[PDB]
């Protein structure tokens, strides 16, 4: 299986992220297809995603490496199929809450594929496979967005037919996941090994990056989404951003930079670049600079997605046991915790309610201080002689 091991896995990663009808879930609900209201979707349906995500991210990471990453990938595929079954056949708001819960389950289980990538290949070329995997996933997301948008805009396709197409694609993704090769008080032993592994320098630094920079990137992405929502150029920017992320993840898969040294400077410079990109993003105004702003966000996802195929790799090379998925899940869970803490701090009305521009200035400052802390840490241990 020289061709059936990593090529097939990246093929499945690409085809499992194809969902032409995913990007139009809201407008499909708000129309002469479900007869929903904006208030119903934005109170009783959308927050169910957040509730379920920061509840189901825990068991998924806790047991995902125990059952060898294949059954939970099949569960993610079946959960996408269940999401689209609820979408095609759902009237009460309870069914849409169930659909949001299942979509949250898939979002939680993405880490399972992220770690199954490392569980398959031999622990030597981890980086070159992480890059390929992230590139395949981002190509899948970009293809899904492009296909859905061109099907609804260039062609004349009703949302029902698009959702049927997406259901067929998800069924094929489940069929593809069926054939994946399954690799070879447990909680106390796992926690002890987790604490033992966190003492390593590279794993510690990159886990901190995943906890903080990923949370910042999620916050920035969601708030650019709401800011642009608050039109064809929106999908154009999102698709271009995903494409640049895929290209940069492939490049990171090809990167040869040493990691014992010349690594903290790398993360510091990448985070500083992200801070500058958000800095430019916040202060765009009525003039055509918005177009230039449209580029900056793309470069934003051209930076964070340049480090995920590296970070995961650098965590896969520092975990002696087969706990490469528990650490990824802990990092994602804590990133979600940090993101929701910040959202409670600023986004909510009961919190420090500020305009979106103020939020983006605050995120620029937060990325800048993260990069400054990383730079200070790099300089503190620079000599050690
Ligand atoms: C279905 N969800 C939803 C909706 N719209 C409504 N009205 N209700 C919903 O529940 N639109 C899609 C949304 C899903 N929300 C999200 C949240 C995060 C990501 C997300 O993780 N995007 C990745 C892109 C790359 C990838 O998929 O791996 C990211 O980097 O943020 C996707 C959808």
From Swiss-Prot:
Catalytic activity, reaction form: 5-amino-1-(5-phospho-beta-D-ribosyl)imidazole-4-carboxamide(in) + (6S)-5-methyl-5,6,7,8-tetrahydrofolate(out) = 5-amino-1-(5-phospho-beta-D-ribosyl)imidazole-4-carboxamide(out) + (6S)-5-methyl-5,6,7,8-tetrahydrofolate(in); 2',3'-cGAMP(out) + 5-amino-1-(5-phospho-beta-D-ribosyl)imidazole-4-carboxamide(in) = 2',3'-cGAMP(in) + 5-amino-1-(5-phospho-beta-D-ribosyl)imidazole-4-carboxamide(out); 3',3'-cGAMP(out) + 5-amino-1-(5-phospho-beta-D-ribosyl)imidazole-4-carboxamide(in) = 3',3'-cGAMP(in) + 5-amino-1-(5-phospho-beta-D-ribosyl)imidazole-4-carboxamide(out)
Effect caused by changing residue 134 to K: Abolishes methotrexate uptake
Impact after mutating residue 238 to A: Abolishes methotrexate uptake
Residues exposed to the Extracellular side: 28-41, 90-93, 156-160, 283-288, 351-358
Superkingdom of source: Eukaryota
Annotated disorder: Megaloblastic anemia, folate-responsive: An autosomal recessive metabolic disorder characterized by megaloblastic anemia resulting from decreased folate transport into erythrocytes. Disease manifestations include hemolytic anemia, hyperhomocysteinemia, and low vitamin B12. Serum folate levels are normal, but erythrocyte folate levels are decreased. Treatment with oral folate corrects the anemia and normalizes homocysteine.
Name under which the protein is recorded: Reduced folate transporter
Organism: Homo sapiens
Source species taxonomy: Eukaryota, Metazoa, Chordata, Craniata, Vertebrata
Region of the whole protein represented: 24 to 457 of 591
